[PDB]
Amino acid sequence: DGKGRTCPKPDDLPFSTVVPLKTFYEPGEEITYSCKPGYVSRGGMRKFICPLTGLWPINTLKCTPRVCPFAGILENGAVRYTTFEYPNTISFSCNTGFYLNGADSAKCTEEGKWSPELPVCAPIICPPPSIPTFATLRVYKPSAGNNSLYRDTAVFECLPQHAMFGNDTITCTTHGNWTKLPECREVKCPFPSRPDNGFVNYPAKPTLYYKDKATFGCHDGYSLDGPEEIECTKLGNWSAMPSCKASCKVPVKKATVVYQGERVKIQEKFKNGMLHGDKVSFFCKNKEKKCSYTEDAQCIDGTIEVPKCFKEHSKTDASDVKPC
Numbered sequence: 001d002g003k004g005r006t007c008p009k010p011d012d013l014p015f016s017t018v019v020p021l022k023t024f025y026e027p028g029e030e031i032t033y034s035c036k037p038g039y040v041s042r043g044g045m046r047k048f049i050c051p052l053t054g055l056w057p058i059n060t061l062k063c064t065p066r067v068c069p070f071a072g073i074l075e076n077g078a079v080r081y082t083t084f085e086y087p088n089t090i091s092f093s094c095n096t097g098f099y100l101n102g103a104d105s106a107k108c109t110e111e112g113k114w115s116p117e118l119p120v121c122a123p124i125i126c127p128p129p130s131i132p133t134f135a136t137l138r139v140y141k142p143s144a145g146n147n148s149l150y151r152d153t154a155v156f157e158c159l160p161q162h163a164m165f166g167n168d169t170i171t172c173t174t175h176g177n178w179t180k181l182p183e184c185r186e187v188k189c190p191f192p193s194r195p196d197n198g199f200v201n202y203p204a205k206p207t208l209y210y211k212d213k214a215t216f217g218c219h220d221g222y223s224l225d226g227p228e229e230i231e232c233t234k235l236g237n238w239s240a241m242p243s244c245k246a247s248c249k250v251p252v253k254k255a256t257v258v259y260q261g262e263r264v265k266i267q268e269k270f271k272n273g274m275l276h277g278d279k280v281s282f283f284c285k286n287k288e289k290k291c292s293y294t295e296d297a298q299c300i301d302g303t304i305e306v307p308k309c310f311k312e313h314s315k316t317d318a319s320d321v322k323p324c
């Protein structure tokens with residue numbers, strides 16, 4: 001006692017480590033502060049001898065994280081980060097059009113450097129595309145040397161007499177390959193039958209291929225129940241096969257009717273008969289409630305059923321009676 005003093009357990013400083021660590025020390029004993037790995041201090045390792053007073057000195061040591069080289073700028077991309085100090089991770093991604101050449105993330109090591117090495121963004125690019133069999137291509141600019149860049153496109157057309165299957169355009173994708181490629185096959189259609197009461201035309205040659213046109217027509221009594229022009233489709237048949245159907249003679253001498261939602265005189269509107277499929281609504285009275293309604297009738301291959309309740313006058317035309 002008096003001379004028999006000791007030093008206490010040393011203070012535990014931020015991110016430090018002390019050796020030898022004991023609960024008390026005789027005077028003359030030595031301790032050694034050192035920053036934890038990943039950290040560093042103004043001056044570094046402090047060393048103290050327990051003095052006779054039993055009081056450890058003042059400790060200048062202040063330990064702070066190492067800082068890895070600045071890494072907040074990724075040419076053509078983006079770095080997510082807190083700080084570039086140990087032991088933080090930082091992650092990377094590229095702007096659109098570019099791919100990441102290197103690791104997606106990196107850690108600041110205790111050694112004070114980035115692991116893995118910081119990546120780089122690079123242009124996504126596709127190689128020259130292959131021409132499918134029986135095709136040419138006539139949309140192709142290589143925008144990157146001989147190679148195409150992301151979202152570039154090429155477009156193929158078949159040969160004459162050949163039918164494409166699949167979209168005609170390919171795009172250079174994110175992964176540096178092109179989108180699904182089309183196929184070009186040869187397609188044949190049979191000869192089209194001439195229709196009863198009409199005619200049909202096509203060019204004078206031994207067999208008929210994809211996108212060949214055939215045009216139809218009817219004799220004066222008749223009209224088509226389909227399109228005037230057809231073509232040879234990809235599946236080896238035609239667009240349609242139209243018939244020549246018979247017109248109807250005006251079913252009555254005089255009457256007002258609805259034709260496509262408008263009142264017309266059937267004698268004026270169909271003076272030269274009704275075409276096949278021409279539909280019309282006739283006016284009939286409801287005898288009981290002294291009002292008027294319509295019922296329909298249609299030309300069907302030279303026949304039109306003038307509805308039962310209609311009556312032809314040389315009281316008034318249901319036309320002129322109020323609606324029900």
Ligand SMILES: *[C@@H]1O[C@H](CO)[C@@H](O[C@@H]2O[C@H](CO)[C@@H](O[C@@H]3O[C@H](CO)[C@@H](O)[C@H](O)[C@@H]3O)[C@H](O)[C@H]2NC(C)=O)[C@H](O)[C@H]1NC(C)=O
Pocket residue numbers: 175177178179180181
């Ligand atoms: C261009 O290259 C990419 C990348 O390799 C191709 O994408 C890959 O496509 C395959 C199939 O489309 C994916 O695999 C799987 O197929 C099975 C079928 O058994 C399916 O059940 C799974 O759900 C899955 O889709 C593969 O995951 C995918 N890879 C990537 C990274 O997306 C692509 O097909 C290529 N494009 C062309 C035109 O060849």
Ligand SMILES: *[C@@H]1O[C@H](CO)[C@@H](O[C@@H]2O[C@H](CO)[C@@H](O[C@@H]3O[C@H](CO)[C@@H](O)[C@H](O)[C@@H]3O)[C@H](O)[C@H]2NC(C)=O)[C@H](O)[C@H]1NC(C)=O
Pocket residue numbers: 235237238239240
């Ligand atoms: C030209 O010829 C084709 C092929 O022979 C005709 O296609 C027929 O219709 C479809 C495909 O277009 C085939 O698939 C199935 O049809 C049913 C109809 O109920 C549909 O609901 C389903 O999705 C099913 O996949 C069908 O098998 C095929 N017919 C035959 C006999 O093979 C096409 O319609 C023709 N075009 C003209 C304008 O004549």
Ligand SMILES: *[C@@H]1O[C@H](CO)[C@@H](O)[C@H](O)[C@H]1NC(C)=O
Pocket residue numbers: 145146
């Ligand atoms: C593509 O570029 C290479 C490298 O310069 C060159 O040798 C080659 O002739 C080019 N190909 C075409 C089709 O121009």
Ligand SMILES: *[C@@H]1O[C@H](CO)[C@@H](O)[C@H](O)[C@H]1NC(C)=O
Pocket residue numbers: 167168169
């Ligand atoms: C193929 O591509 C577009 C969209 O990618 C699609 O809407 C259409 O089926 C095709 N368009 C053209 C112009 O060929």
